[PDB]
Write an enzyme that holds these catalytic residues in place. Structure first.
Site, PDB file in Angstrom:
ATOM      1  N   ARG A 164       0.779  -1.226   0.000  1.00  0.00           N
ATOM      2  CA  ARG A 164       0.000   0.000   0.000  1.00  0.00           C
ATOM      3  C   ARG A 164       0.814   1.281   0.000  1.00  0.00           C
ATOM      4  O   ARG A 164       0.260   2.342  -0.015  1.00  0.00           O
ATOM      5  CB  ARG A 164      -1.025   0.064   1.195  1.00  0.00           C
ATOM      6  CG  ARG A 164      -2.064  -1.048   1.121  1.00  0.00           C
ATOM      7  CD  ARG A 164      -3.319  -0.681   1.897  1.00  0.00           C
ATOM      8  NE  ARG A 164      -2.999  -0.512   3.317  1.00  0.00           N
ATOM      9  CZ  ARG A 164      -3.874  -0.148   4.247  1.00  0.00           C
ATOM     10  NH1 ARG A 164      -5.141   0.097   3.935  1.00  0.00           N
ATOM     11  NH2 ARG A 164      -3.480  -0.034   5.489  1.00  0.00           N
ATOM     12  N   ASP A 165       2.114   1.202   0.012  1.00  0.00           N
ATOM     13  CA  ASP A 165       2.888   2.427  -0.041  1.00  0.00           C
ATOM     14  C   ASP A 165       4.150   2.231  -0.910  1.00  0.00           C
ATOM     15  O   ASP A 165       5.212   2.719  -0.563  1.00  0.00           O
ATOM     16  CB  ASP A 165       3.232   2.889   1.383  1.00  0.00           C
ATOM     17  CG  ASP A 165       3.792   4.313   1.436  1.00  0.00           C
ATOM     18  OD1 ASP A 165       3.269   5.219   0.766  1.00  0.00           O
ATOM     19  OD2 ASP A 165       4.771   4.525   2.153  1.00  0.00           O
TER      20      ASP A 165
END
Lengths: 276, 267
Positions: free
Chosen positions: B148-149
């Site tokens: 997610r990052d």
């Protein structure tokens, strides 16, 4: 939407969808009846068009299944999924089948408003049974944090006991292994429990005083005195000074024993009424 | 505010001299640390918390680092420890996460290479393959772990000249997993983020798009860029397909895409 009237197959169950019981954000909840057996269920239908929502839904189902088995949690019966293309919605469709309860606790409490304040013993049983459910969550390894405890989500079972059913906001730690201190599966950091304790304190306050606490204990109350120190101990501004759920449950057991109450027993003064 | 440099920190048998700051931010600072008894060097991340939500996120990060450690493109987890709020010098919960010390942040090495012109397709290939292989290890877990990052600025280069992922502070998965393995649960957003990385490695700007009309150097990557940057998540490739295509590209270029990225390692 006219899901009502349809028949839905889940493994060996053939479920006639009788009516809507509840609706809102992700999902609707229906009353369903198995054609072969006559058994009745609650059927929750959650639709998703998106991977983040898929993850939240599947996570909710996993929590329902994990927590099922406790007497104050709704019983998980089954779940299934329909892929986006094979579904009639053009969306991912998730079906979660659980025990059918009598109705929402607040519907039964409304019936009492005309009659008078709840007895301390009724409050005691509602709150004990709620806190016992939360205890079962917090005692898992690692703890499961509810994050959305509210009076309006509590159910009353057909036996007149409280059941928790709303694990859509719950969270925990994944891949938990079952001078500074090396981190052990024996960790003692709060990870959200304290906010559940605050939310429960608000429930207790509301059950006694029938007003929301944030907008102190009413100065002229002499009916709910037995609960005043617990309310104050759960609603501490500093989370770390709040009781744990184990201490809350211990205190409610002491109170029950001193009042000659079995706090697990059916809440009969609600069960004489109508709410679902 | 780093009073921490110059201290010695005990973690089991390790006695770690905190030599200097390597990286910082909101949650956390990262330090270079050296074990007195062995001479071994580590990265030591110190995460401070004054609240239970942050305790949870921190412990979750540690659990992901430990679960993913062992893969050649993930930083190696070594140890973790905590100091309670009262016994800590910060007046906060203090968490210490000890991992492998890398050579530095990938983008530092790419900056040095700017002077020499565009990266070769072989270098892009190796960086990107090694990054995707890490993400593949995440997505293949049961249930999948979603990062997610994913960003080029967070990638590290190891002392052997290979790419390591190290930032699992935004990752998520499903707990208490038992009928469900067909649904995406976040993989497609990681794919998009990786597509942005590939674009950035080739063309040296973030796509947000369009492949530059005059490019003829990075043609070999054009369809993979387009297939990962599809507007509709469900039309994006899976990480297995991405890795498969990179392996084919590698074999046609005579490259072992797991091997040291030597052109970065001389900087």
């Amino acid at each position: 939407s006219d899901f009502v009237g349809q028949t839905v197959e889940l493994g060996e169950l053939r479920l006639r969808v009788r009516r809507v019981l509840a609706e809102g954000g992700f999902a609707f909840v229906y009353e369903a009846q198995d054609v072969g057996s006559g058994r009745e269920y609650a059927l929750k239908r959650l639709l998703s068009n998106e991977e983040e929502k898929n993850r939240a839904i599947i996570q909710e189902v996993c929590f329902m299944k994990k927590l099922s088995g406790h007497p104050n949690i709704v019983q998980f019966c089954s779940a299934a999924s329909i892929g986006k293309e094979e579904s009639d919605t053009g969306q991912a469709e998730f079906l979660l089948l659980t025990e059918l309860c009598k109705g929402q606790l607040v519907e039964f409490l409304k019936k009492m408003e005309s009659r008078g304040p709840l007895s301390c013993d009724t409050v005691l049983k509602i709150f004990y049974q709620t806190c016992r459910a939360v205890q079962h969550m917090h005692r898992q390894k690692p703890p499961i944090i509810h994050r959305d405890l509210k009076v309006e989500n509590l159910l009353l079972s057909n036996q007149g006991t409280i059941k928790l059913c709303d694990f859509g906001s719950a969270t925990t730690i994944s891949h938990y292994p079952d001078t500074p201190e090396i981190i052990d599966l024996y960790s003692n950091f709060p990870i959200g429990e304290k906010q559940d304790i605050w939310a429960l304190g608000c429930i207790l306050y509301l059950l006694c005083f029938r007003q929301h606490p944030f907008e102190s204990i009413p100065p002229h109350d002499t009916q709910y005195t037995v609960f005043h120190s617990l309310i104050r101990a759960m609603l501490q501004v500093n989370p770390e000074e709040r009781l744990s759920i184990a201490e809350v449950v211990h205190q409610l057991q002491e109170i029950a024993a001193a009042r000659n109450v079995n706090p697990k027993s059916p809440i009969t003064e609600l069960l004489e009424q109508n709410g679902g």
